[PDB]
Amino acid sequence: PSVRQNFHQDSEAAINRQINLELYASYVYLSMAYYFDRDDQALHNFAKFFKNQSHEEREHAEKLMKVQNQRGGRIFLQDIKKPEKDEWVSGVEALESALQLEKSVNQSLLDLHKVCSEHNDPHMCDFIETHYLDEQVKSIKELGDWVTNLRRMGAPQNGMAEYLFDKHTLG
């Protein structure tokens, strides 16, 4: 591509991996959203939070697709794997699962940053710094905050805990 400059095939390949992972995260969140939409779960603010997380992960993916094209890389999409579970058990356990997902995505972003840093690609390094790393830190901190509150309230055994958390923190 006549636009390609200082853009290594390792960086290009790692961006394609990150694209698939962000789409994967979007899919996990979509699953969690409609799990709490079930009539036997019915925590609709949990559902709404997870649904919005799904749309945001989808935007995360598209911005990587955009920068791949901007730099002259070539997008190669892969299957979006179905999530590990069909049922997420409880509100606090879904959030704990989400925390592990965000930490895995974060580690993959840090690995992506290392690849671009090794190939002296400061455009990509700051693109990741600007658009992903602090977003990830904030998302992880928030999930940690929420898991702490839920567990301290006795969730999931305390049947009032996730109901009230859904009303107060998630509204």
Binding site for Fe ion (CB under 5 A): 22, 57, 60
Q: Closer CB to its own copies, residue 18 or residue 41?
A: 41
Q: How far is the CB of 170 from its own copies (least distance, A)?
A: 12
Partner from Fe ion, its own copies, none binding residue 39, C-beta < 5-8 Å depending on class: its own copies
CA distance 37 to 130: 34
Residue with tokens 């190939």: 119
Among 13, 52, 89, 164, binds its own copies (CB under 8 A): 164
Centre a 10 Å sphere on the Cβ of residue 86 and count the other Cβ atoms it contains: 8
Whether the Cβ atoms of residue 118 and residue 6 lie closer than 8 Å to each other: no
Whether the Cβ atoms of residue 95 and residue 146 lie closer than 8 Å to each other: yes
Q: Is 125 in the site for its own copies (CB under 8 A)?
A: yes
Partner from its own copies, Fe ion, none binding residue 60, C-beta < 5-8 Å depending on class: Fe ion
Biggest alpha carbon–alpha carbon distance for the chain: 61
Q: Which tokens sit at 12?
A: 């290009």
Q: Is 84 in the site for its own copies (CB under 8 A)?
A: no
Scanning residues 19 to 48, which ones bind its own copies (CB under 8 A)? Answer: 23, 27, 30-31, 34-35, 37-44
Whether the Cβ atoms of residue 95 and residue 141 lie closer than 8 Å to each other: no
Partner from Fe ion, its own copies, none binding residue 57, C-beta < 5-8 Å depending on class: Fe ion
